[PDB]
Design an enzyme around this catalytic site. Structure first.
Site, PDB file in Angstrom:
ATOM      1  N   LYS A  15       0.824  -1.226   0.000  1.00 19.09           N
ATOM      2  CA  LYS A  15       0.000   0.000   0.000  1.00 19.09           C
ATOM      3  C   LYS A  15       0.850   1.264   0.000  1.00 19.09           C
ATOM      4  CE  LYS A  15      -2.677  -0.540   3.686  1.00 19.09           C
ATOM      5  NZ  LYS A  15      -2.357  -1.778   4.422  1.00 19.09           N
ATOM      6  N   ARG A  91     -10.346  -0.215   8.423  1.00 22.19           N
ATOM      7  CA  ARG A  91      -9.633  -1.416   8.812  1.00 22.19           C
ATOM      8  C   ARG A  91     -10.563  -2.389   9.509  1.00 22.19           C
ATOM      9  NH1 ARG A  91      -3.784  -2.151   9.154  1.00 22.19           N
ATOM     10  NH2 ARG A  91      -3.542   0.059   8.570  1.00 22.19           N
ATOM     11  N   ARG A 130      12.248  -4.422   5.701  1.00 23.45           N
ATOM     12  CA  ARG A 130      11.835  -3.029   5.498  1.00 23.45           C
ATOM     13  C   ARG A 130      12.621  -1.973   6.311  1.00 23.45           C
ATOM     14  NH1 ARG A 130       5.557  -1.208   5.772  1.00 23.45           N
ATOM     15  NH2 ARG A 130       5.602  -2.457   7.690  1.00 23.45           N
ATOM     16  N   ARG A 163      10.731   0.019  11.649  1.00 23.94           N
ATOM     17  CA  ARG A 163       9.506   0.215  12.404  1.00 23.94           C
ATOM     18  C   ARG A 163       9.482  -0.741  13.583  1.00 23.94           C
ATOM     19  NH1 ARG A 163       4.344   0.498   8.453  1.00 23.94           N
ATOM     20  NH2 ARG A 163       3.584  -0.723  10.238  1.00 23.94           N
ATOM     21  N   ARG A 174      -0.370  -9.041  13.768  1.00 22.09           N
ATOM     22  CA  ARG A 174      -0.881  -8.227  12.669  1.00 22.09           C
ATOM     23  C   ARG A 174      -1.627  -8.991  11.584  1.00 22.09           C
ATOM     24  NH1 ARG A 174       4.311  -4.809  11.000  1.00 22.09           N
ATOM     25  NH2 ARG A 174       2.845  -3.800   9.557  1.00 22.09           N
TER      26      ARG A 174
HETATM   27  N1  LIG Z   1       5.679  -5.785  -5.057  1.00 29.67           N
HETATM   28  C1  LIG Z   1       6.665  -5.789  -4.137  1.00 29.67           C
HETATM   29  N2  LIG Z   1       7.643  -6.721  -4.186  1.00 29.67           N
HETATM   30  C2  LIG Z   1       8.680  -6.669  -3.329  1.00 29.67           C
HETATM   31  N3  LIG Z   1       8.905  -5.784  -2.359  1.00 29.67           N
HETATM   32  C3  LIG Z   1       7.847  -4.919  -2.198  1.00 29.67           C
HETATM   33  C4  LIG Z   1       6.725  -4.861  -3.066  1.00 29.67           C
HETATM   34  N4  LIG Z   1       5.922  -3.837  -2.643  1.00 29.67           N
HETATM   35  C5  LIG Z   1       6.445  -3.351  -1.561  1.00 29.67           C
HETATM   36  N5  LIG Z   1       7.595  -3.994  -1.201  1.00 29.67           N
HETATM   37  C6  LIG Z   1       8.308  -3.813   0.084  1.00 29.67           C
HETATM   38  O1  LIG Z   1       7.933  -4.613   1.197  1.00 29.67           O
HETATM   39  C7  LIG Z   1       7.851  -3.810   2.355  1.00 29.67           C
HETATM   40  C8  LIG Z   1       6.350  -3.492   2.594  1.00 29.67           C
HETATM   41  O2  LIG Z   1       5.819  -2.549   1.647  1.00 29.67           O
HETATM   42  P1  LIG Z   1       5.050  -1.372   2.035  1.00 29.67           P
HETATM   43  O3  LIG Z   1       4.483  -0.707   0.909  1.00 29.67           O
HETATM   44  O4  LIG Z   1       5.860  -0.511   2.940  1.00 29.67           O
HETATM   45  O5  LIG Z   1       3.872  -1.934   2.827  1.00 29.67           O
HETATM   46  P2  LIG Z   1       2.423  -1.744   3.310  1.00 29.67           P
HETATM   47  O6  LIG Z   1       1.545  -2.518   2.544  1.00 29.67           O
HETATM   48  O7  LIG Z   1       2.091  -0.276   3.297  1.00 29.67           O
HETATM   49  O8  LIG Z   1       2.352  -2.227   4.734  1.00 29.67           O
HETATM   50  P3  LIG Z   1       2.238  -1.815   6.204  1.00 29.67           P
HETATM   51  O9  LIG Z   1       3.006  -2.765   6.995  1.00 29.67           O
HETATM   52  O10 LIG Z   1       2.624  -0.422   6.330  1.00 29.67           O
HETATM   53  O11 LIG Z   1       0.746  -1.927   6.527  1.00 29.67           O
HETATM   54  P4  LIG Z   1      -0.222  -2.039   7.716  1.00 29.67           P
HETATM   55  O12 LIG Z   1      -1.625  -1.911   7.248  1.00 29.67           O
HETATM   56  O13 LIG Z   1       0.091  -3.229   8.462  1.00 29.67           O
HETATM   57  O14 LIG Z   1       0.232  -0.852   8.577  1.00 29.67           O
HETATM   58  P5  LIG Z   1       0.036   0.607   8.969  1.00 29.67           P
HETATM   59  O15 LIG Z   1       1.247   1.348   9.142  1.00 29.67           O
HETATM   60  O16 LIG Z   1      -1.066   1.165   8.157  1.00 29.67           O
HETATM   61  O17 LIG Z   1      -0.583   0.515  10.337  1.00 29.67           O
HETATM   62  C9  LIG Z   1       0.179   0.164  11.510  1.00 29.67           C
HETATM   63  C10 LIG Z   1      -0.675  -0.024  12.781  1.00 29.67           C
HETATM   64  O18 LIG Z   1      -1.412   1.192  13.082  1.00 29.67           O
HETATM   65  C11 LIG Z   1      -2.745   0.788  13.445  1.00 29.67           C
HETATM   66  N6  LIG Z   1      -3.781   1.326  12.617  1.00 29.67           N
HETATM   67  C12 LIG Z   1      -3.581   1.994  11.439  1.00 29.67           C
HETATM   68  N7  LIG Z   1      -4.668   2.343  10.853  1.00 29.67           N
HETATM   69  C13 LIG Z   1      -5.683   1.852  11.674  1.00 29.67           C
HETATM   70  C14 LIG Z   1      -7.065   1.871  11.601  1.00 29.67           C
HETATM   71  N8  LIG Z   1      -7.673   2.413  10.544  1.00 29.67           N
HETATM   72  N9  LIG Z   1      -7.753   1.234  12.563  1.00 29.67           N
HETATM   73  C15 LIG Z   1      -7.122   0.630  13.547  1.00 29.67           C
HETATM   74  N10 LIG Z   1      -5.834   0.647  13.819  1.00 29.67           N
HETATM   75  C16 LIG Z   1      -5.126   1.224  12.811  1.00 29.67           C
HETATM   76  C17 LIG Z   1      -2.712  -0.693  13.785  1.00 29.67           C
HETATM   77  O19 LIG Z   1      -2.139  -0.899  15.080  1.00 29.67           O
HETATM   78  C18 LIG Z   1      -1.762  -1.095  12.658  1.00 29.67           C
HETATM   79  O20 LIG Z   1      -1.250  -2.440  12.799  1.00 29.67           O
HETATM   80  C19 LIG Z   1       8.860  -2.639   2.112  1.00 29.67           C
HETATM   81  O21 LIG Z   1      10.169  -2.989   2.479  1.00 29.67           O
HETATM   82  C20 LIG Z   1       8.718  -2.443   0.603  1.00 29.67           C
HETATM   83  O22 LIG Z   1       9.834  -1.917  -0.080  1.00 29.67           O
HETATM   84 MG   LIG Z   2       2.225   1.402   4.853  1.00 26.04          MG
END
Ligand SMILES: Nc1ncnc2c1ncn2[C@@H]1O[C@H](COP(=O)(O)OP(=O)(O)OP(=O)(O)OP(=O)(O)OP(=O)(O)OC[C@H]2O[C@@H](n3cnc4c(N)ncnc43)[C@H](O)[C@@H]2O)[C@@H](O)[C@H]1O
Ligand SMILES: [Mg+2]
Length: 218
Positions: A15, A91, A130, A163, A174
């Protein structure tokens, strides 16, 4: 260059990697709730400090908090008048229903919900390799997507960090939360008819061309 959309995917799916592409192309605001929370933590606010403990345990922050956060950004962020990319919100089903109602009252309904589908087995290597640039939210991967200046954010030269929720233990928590709580929403958008699935196991440029094809914009 107007889109209103959600990105849905398991932890590490891509994402944050694709959002910049969408943001560039459509000049939409990128509303990433994870980044928003990490900003709270960085400002040392009480919300940020209590959210950090939940995030590092792979839990989910309260719907009430998250809905309020997004409500304010949609309301008084000027950038969200062009359109927006929701990343990490909704989410849960309650967040999805409440978003639905908010956008109805505003008369600006979602156009697309893109699911980035990728098997869980692939997600561990992505998470544990990452590195992020804290200030921009930009993600690199030690193997799959290196910084040119390794451990240095390219665009600012500033250092990259890991992170605190990016470990195999938290990631198991997660992933379970995602399948239990978040994955039901995909059916919600399937019923509303704005869902499209994308193969996020492909490399970045290939996923991006897939997303463009699925948005009906390429
Ligand atoms: N095609 C490909 N092939 C190879 N390599 C690739 C690739 N695409 C990307 N990569 C790589 O792989 C890695 C991942 O890519 P990357 O793009 O960074 O990943 P991502 O999909 O954005 O993943 P996140 O881990 O950030 O998502 P999340 O939903 O768990 O977390 P968030 O921060 O929103 O949320 C964190 C926490 O906040 C909370 N939170 C956030 N929003 C809410 C909400 N709405 N409600 C409740 N709690 C919430 C929860 O506690 C949650 O767990 C990188 O190293 C990158 O280079
Ligand atoms: Mg992200």
């Amino acid at each position: 260059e107007s889109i209103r959309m959600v990105l849905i995917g398991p932890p590490g799916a891509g994402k944050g990697t694709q959002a910049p592409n969408l943001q560039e192309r459509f000049h939409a605001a990128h509303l990433a709730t994870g980044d928003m929370l990490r900003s709270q933590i960085a400002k040392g606010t009480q919300l940020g400090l209590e959210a950090k403990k939940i995030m590092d345990q792979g839990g989910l922050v309260s719907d009430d908090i998250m809905v309020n956060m997004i409500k304010d950004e949609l309301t008084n962020n000027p950038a969200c008048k062009n359109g927006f990319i929701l990343d990490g919100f909704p989410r849960t089903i309650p967040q999805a229903e409440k978003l639905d109602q908010m956008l109805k009252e505003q008369g600006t309904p979602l156009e697309k919900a893109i699911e980035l589908k990728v098997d869980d087995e692939l997600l561990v290597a992505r998470i544990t390799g990452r590195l992020i640039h804290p200030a921009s939210g930009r993600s690199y991967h030690k193997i799959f997507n290196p910084p040119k200046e390794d451990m240095k954010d390219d665009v600012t030269g500033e250092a990259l960090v890991q992170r605190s929720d990016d470990n195999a233990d938290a990631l198991k928590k997660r992933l379970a939360a995602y399948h239990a709580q978040t994955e039901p929403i995909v059916d919600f958008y399937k019923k509303t008819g704005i869902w499209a699935g994308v193969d996020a196991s492909q490399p970045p440029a290939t996923v991006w061309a897939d997303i463009l094809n699925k948005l009906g914009k390429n």
